Amino acid sequence: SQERKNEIIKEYARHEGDTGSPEVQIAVLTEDINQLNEHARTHKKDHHSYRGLMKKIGHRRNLLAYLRKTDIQRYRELIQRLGLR
Amino acid sequence: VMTDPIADFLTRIRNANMVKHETLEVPASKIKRDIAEILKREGFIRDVEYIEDDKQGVIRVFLKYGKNEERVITNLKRISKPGLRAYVKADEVPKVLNGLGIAIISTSEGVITDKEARAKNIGGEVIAYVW
Amino acid sequence: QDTKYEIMYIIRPNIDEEAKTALVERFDTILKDNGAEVIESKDWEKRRLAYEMNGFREGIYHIVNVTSPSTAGAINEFDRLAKINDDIIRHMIVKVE
Amino acid sequence: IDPKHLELEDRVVAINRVTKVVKGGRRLRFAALVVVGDKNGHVGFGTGKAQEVPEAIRKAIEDAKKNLVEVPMVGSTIPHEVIGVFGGGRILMKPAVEGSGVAAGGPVRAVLELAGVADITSKSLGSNTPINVVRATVEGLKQLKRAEEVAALRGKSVEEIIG
Amino acid sequence: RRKVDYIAANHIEYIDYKDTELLKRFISERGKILPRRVTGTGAKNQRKLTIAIKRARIMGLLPFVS
RNA sequence: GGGAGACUUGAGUGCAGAAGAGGAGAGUGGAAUUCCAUGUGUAGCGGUGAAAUGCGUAGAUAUAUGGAGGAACACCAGUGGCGAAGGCGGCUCUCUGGUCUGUAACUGACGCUGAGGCUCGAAAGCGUGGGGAGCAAACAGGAUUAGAUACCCUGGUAGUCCACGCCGUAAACGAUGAGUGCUAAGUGUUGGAGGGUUUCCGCCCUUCAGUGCUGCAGCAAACGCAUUAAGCACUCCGCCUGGGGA
Ligand SMILES: [K+]
Ligand SMILES: [Mg+2]
Ligand SMILES: [Mg+2]
């Protein structure tokens, strides 16, 4: 949702202007992915939506790889905040 | 993407040459500037000019024709593809068409011709022939 | 966000105004019970139908403009109850901008 | 582009007996390919057809005279390597050293001996159809160039180009 | 041929299935919907008209047949 | 190439908009068939190249009023739309995905390809349980035929349908891998945006993303392709090395 995405940007971002950043993107994608996994458990047959789920997941994984390359401290802080492995 | 802007530059030149266009514009880099200057001062091009814009310096070319019809350039070809890069020694320097064309080489001295390379007794990476 | 829902439904032609008004108020009351705010309730027309929808070739149309969340089950409740009720012939819902 | 005032002499590549079919069996004609030249640079080829070998030869010669082209030479050699393509016939021709003679076994040998190229190294990569190999040959000899021409185009001098 | 849409000319929008006055002229006899190439509407408006007409049919405002 | 940086065009996020048989779940519909019931009415109906099997006097066909049940959605509907493909057309609602346009705020090369793996995947088919209107392999009978293990006809079982789990194949085809850039033009068309007019409508010009036709260069063995390339180029993956055996 737009209000939830606003909250997530304001929380995880470095500024109120820095809408775009890896931590911001990943924080949005994780909530979207949780909603989609619940939707999939409720709608097991919607493979057409599971595809977009996997695409979002790959996007998040690539962002996380960029973070592991550039800033390992930022990476670990992010993952402690989010709860990912 | 643009995994080979040098070859994109060469092919854009080739395409414009085949349609007999008069000029070109390209997102430039320093190696493109070197190649364009070499062509300028070797006779395959009439003129070349620069343009400075924030994202990337554009370079524009003004091609050459013996008449309205006849072409000075016939075709070009990159050898370092880059999937297989072509490094060569001062003896293995190519001789494009027995001296009627030119090979474009980068060496410790810089970006130069087969003339200068085979004279100085250096070699380097080959990046383009020109028939 | 709360989404606007036009709701038509077809009252039988030979019902009394008393029970009819209590019935419209019932459905509005149930929408409000499930949490869907009714902004307008109005009878559209009484008409000769295109065919015999419940045997009655004639009908009386009512419109119920509503604002509510999509998660609220107000529309589903109105739906099941109009199905069960044999007085109204059809209902129909329209998501509106 | 004129066969006039030239001592063109000819040579036949091949006569392919070639058939049309009719209700009354087969209408057998002879098709010939001939290459003619002056052994100075000027060479051409022609296709002829007729119910007679010499008639098709005459027609092909008369068509070859009307389609000449001039090849450059450098001490009985071509200036630079070239690849000629014409629809299935790839031929590469290299400038060879003097005294090495010709390296071909016809039709290319006929074309180049008539054009006057005494010393060359060639190879037919693709097909073997005499017509199209000869056509790729002339296409390559058309791709070829002259140092004076290229230097007048480029503006640079001849020595300034060859280095 | 260059033809005009009723909807575009009238500056009408948000087509309600209740609007029998506007939907019934896009209908031939026995309830069939006129083709776009007959009437001269846009694709967007034509599809909105299809949906509105089908709504009207199921709601008895218009007939499926006759 | 390695390392320390810096930038925004690429890639992506954000604002605002657009479209849509995009997908899954739920319910609802009118038409038509089949069956059942009620009347009318009575000798043929059906079917064929011919006939015949069949059904019908125990009331057929047909006709009119209802009811049950399943499946598919006339017009709109179009080399039109969406989707990675397969595929997806009644209607409404719940949840949800991708795409396009501007915007130039933000990150600042984060991208592409991608063996091996994972997922999806026409129809047939398999397992369990429902259901089964019509259609229909197998099968029966009538015919035809020299024969007819077929084409034709009358019937008709699995199956077609629903839920789950398996299968994982296709002329799964644009018989054209994905990505990027460059390269005459013409014309329609879908979704937008901007501008110059127009009382609005509308027309015009530009531009993006698709979707068709004609066609220059070039390519092609030819057929044909041609800004939706089969042209010029580059990166990666998959694949071929005569036919059969196989
Ligand atoms: K089954
Ligand atoms: Mg199946
Ligand atoms: Mg075409």
Judge contact between B6 and B78, C-beta under 8 A.
yes
Method by which the model was determined: cryo-EM
Q: Looking at strand F, which nucleotides approach a protein CB closer than 7 A?
A: 7-10, 12-16, 19-25, 27-31, 66, 74-78, 80, 83-86, 90-98, 105-107, 109-112, 114, 119-121, 164-165, 179-184, 189-192, 200-203, 217-218, 220-222, 231-236
Nearest one of C80, C89, C85 to C52, comparing CA atoms: C89
**Sign of CA pseudo-dihedral A26, A31, A36, A37:** positive
- The Cα B73–Cα B50 span in angstroms is 21
Q: Best interface-test mutation with C: which of E59, E64, E66 has the largest number of C CBs within 10 A?
A: E59
Q: Which residue is nearest to nucleotide F76 (CA to C1')?
A: E33
Query: What is residue E19's three-state secondary structure?
Result: coil
- The reply to whether omega before C69 is within 30° of 0 (cis) is no
Compute the distance between CA of residue D64 and CA of residue A71 in angstroms, rounded to an integer: 76
Chain B with chain D: Cβ pairs closer than 8 A? 36
Nearest to D134 by CA among D40, D66, D69: D69
C32-67 CB burial, b ≥16 within 10 A, e <16: eeeebebeebeeeeebebbeebeeeeebbbbebebe
Amino acid at E59: M
Closest Cα to residue D77, out of D103, D95, D65? D95
Q: In this complex, do B66 and D153 lie within 8 Å of one another by their Cβ atoms?
A: yes
CB contact under 8 A, C50 and E62: yes
What six digits make up the tokens of D19?
Answer: 């058939």
Q: How buried is D54 (Cβ within 10 angstroms: 0-12 exposed, 13-18 middle, 19+ buried)? A: exposed
Give the pairing type, strands B58-62 and B23-27: antiparallel
Report resolution (Å) to 1 decimal: 2.9
DSSP state of D96: P
Per-residue tokens: C7: 């709701």
Q: How far is the CA of A51 from the centre of ligand 1 (A)?
A: 28
CA distance linking residue D89 with residue D77, whole number of Å: 22
The nearest CA of chain B is from the CA of D68 a distance in Å of 20
Among B8, B55, B54, B50, residue whose Cα is nearest residue B30:
B50
Q: Which amino acid makes up residue B78?
A: R
Q: Is the dihedral of CA E22, E28, E33, E38 positive or negative?
A: negative
Q: What angle do CA D103, D78, D160 make, to 5 degrees?
A: 145
Compute the distance between CA of residue D89 and CA of residue E43 in angstroms, rounded to an integer: 54
